[PDB]
């Protein structure tokens, strides 16, 4: 693990030099929870490479720069109430929890991954992350409204439930476009002056499958 962490520190330094990681909060989160903690043993040797990696059930853990970009856009602060849609390995949720210092809610539709993520989080000593099995395109009403909702799967359009569950002034970060390609990373802010949207570039996440996602 010592060798793996050395490589990871270089990755974080690189992201900072690239201007990808720009806040100390995101840098600290990345250093506390290296990506190798979230992937199967056979992929740990590649955890420091800035590329997405496979996880069970045909899904993947995002590339380090993509996770960093989304966290920086989120502008997370202690005490915020965050909902992540698409737990996967639980890596992103762990990072979020380190920054907000409170309960984080994350939803995953595949039972196998709910278990996978729970094991990774427990193994890493994370307690504030709460993994729920369900259709995240419907959000998670029990703990709404949220300061930020971070969706890590691509949707064909912006799910209305996610907008409804945002606090006034809150934001939704979500990929919108085609099934598994040609998606645009959107930053959607819910304000009194209306819904404001900023496009952040092309991406290619796994599809958001659900009632308000893909069929
Ligand atoms: C490829 S992963 C992204 C990364 C993940 N955030 C991590 O830290 O590993 C995201 C996923 O969202 C799931 N996802 C898709 N549709 C979903 C839905 N309707 N509700 C919840 N999760 C969904 C997939 O099964 C998959 O694991």
Curated annotation (Swiss-Prot):
Reactions listed under catalytic activity: [protein]-L-isoaspartate + S-adenosyl-L-methionine = [protein]-L-isoaspartate alpha-methyl ester + S-adenosyl-L-homocysteine
Pfam families in alphabetical order: PCMT (PF01135)
Gene3D superfamilies: Vaccinia Virus protein VP39
EC class (word): transferase
Family annotation (CDD domains): AdoMet_MTases (cd02440)
Localization annotation: Cytoplasm
Purpose: Catalyzes the methyl esterification of L-isoaspartyl residues in peptides and proteins that result from spontaneous decomposition of normal L-aspartyl and L-asparaginyl residues. It plays a role in the repair and/or degradation of damaged proteins.
Oligomeric and partner information: Monomer.
Protein name: Protein-L-isoaspartate O-methyltransferase
Species of origin: Pyrococcus furiosus (strain ATCC 43587 / DSM 3638 / JCM 8422 / Vc1)
Gene from which this protein is expressed: pcm
